[PDB]
């Protein structure tokens, strides 16, 4: 899920 992407 995109909500897990960092920065």
């Amino acid at each position, epitope marked *: 899920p995109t909500s897990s*992407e*960092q*920065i």
Partner: antibody
Framework: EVNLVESGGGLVQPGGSLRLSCATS????????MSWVRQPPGKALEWLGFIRNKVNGYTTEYGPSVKGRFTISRDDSQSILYLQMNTLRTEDSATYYC??????????????WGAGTTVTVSS | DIVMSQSPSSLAVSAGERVTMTCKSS????????????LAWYQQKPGQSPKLLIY???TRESGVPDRFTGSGSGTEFTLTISSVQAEDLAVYYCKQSYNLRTFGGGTKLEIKR
């Protein structure tokens, strides 16, 4: 303070194309994910898509309604965000908004919005 | 592709009364890694750009009056407003940011008199 200002929104004949800009100031642009949201008159907000930062490969994601027809890009040296609109339809008539897609601490919400630029698609 | 549904479409309320509005998502907006439900609430007053009120389902944005409380998790969320003021006239949109982003159809808050 943080400012976002969309430009390029005008009257365009159906079928033609148009490129919107979002000039920014007040924050480190290169560190952010940026999205575009629109809204037809008296209608609901619609997420158009976003573009990841340099650290994430400048890749993009779109909403079903525009995927394939619109292209989001950016110029980190200028702190400007672009939205290329091709094959315009009447359904494209709307106020287009530029937003900061805050990713820090995994928040993932739109904390800053521009005033919007209006696109009218008619003959 | 997560579908968001809001209800009611529009509600009329008097200054001082409380109001509640719901948002339903077709999929769980909860993230196991981050431990947060990615549902945010936006307030859009007449002629203005939308404004963030609440994120992570129940966290209130800086500067947002305490009478605005968000709650829920999974697929059913709620936006509650205690002691509504006239100034609260606006359309309230929920939005999921679990995967991509999707806006609800919005709830139009009208002021009774």
């Amino acid at each position: 303070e943080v400012n976002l200002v969309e430009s390029g929104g005008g009257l365009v004949q159906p079928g033609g194309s148009l490129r919107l800009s979002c000039a920014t100031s007040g924050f480190t642009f290169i560190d952010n994910y940026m999205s575009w949201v629109r809204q037809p008159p008296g209608k609901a907000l619609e997420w158009l898509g976003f573009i990841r930062n340099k650290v994430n490969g400048y890749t993009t994601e779109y909403g079903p309604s525009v995927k394939g027809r619109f292209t989001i890009s950016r110029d980190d040296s200028q702190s400007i965000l672009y939205l290329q609109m091709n094959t315009l339809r009447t359904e494209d008539s709307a106020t287009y908004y530029c937003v900061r897609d805050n990713g820090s601490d995994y928040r993932w919400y739109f904390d800053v919005w521009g005033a919007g630029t209006t696109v009218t698609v008619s003959s | 592709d997560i579908v968001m549904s809001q209800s009611p479409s529009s509600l009329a309320v008097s200054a001082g009364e409380r109001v509640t509005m719901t948002c339903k998502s077709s999929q769980s907006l909860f993230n196991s890694k981050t431990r947060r439900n990615y549902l945010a609430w936006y307030q859009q007053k007449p002629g203005q750009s939308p404004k963030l009120l609440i994120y992570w389902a129940s966290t209130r944005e800086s500067g947002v009056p305490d009478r605005f409380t968000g709650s829920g998790s999974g697929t059913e969320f709620t936006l509650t407003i205690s002691s509504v003021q006239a100034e609260d006239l606006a359309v309230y949109y929920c939005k999921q940011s679990y995967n991509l982003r999707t806006f609800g159809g919005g709830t139009k808050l009208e002021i009774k008199r």
